[PDB]
Design a protein that fits this description.
It comes from Mus musculus (Mouse). By secondary structure, the chain is an all-alpha fold. It has three helices and no strands. The protein starts with 6 loop residues before the first helix and ends with a helix.
Length: 57
């Protein structure tokens, strides 16, 4: 997927729901991880690891 155009519609709705699944500081970050894949549940998977990696003892 070299070109871009339809992704705008996905990220639009996806991000909207992200506000109800995770905070902005997270989404805004994870969004950089999957610049080609923007999903409500998918983004959750990445965050699950990102958080666990920065979890106290």
């Amino acid at each position: 997927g070299p070109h871009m155009g339809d992704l705008a519609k996905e990220r639009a709705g996806v991000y909207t729901k992200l506000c109800g699944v995770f905070p902005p500081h997270l989404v805004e970050a994870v969004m950089r991880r999957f610049p080609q894949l923007l999903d409500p549940q998918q983004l959750a998977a990445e965050i699950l690891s990102y958080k666990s990696q920065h979890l106290s003892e």
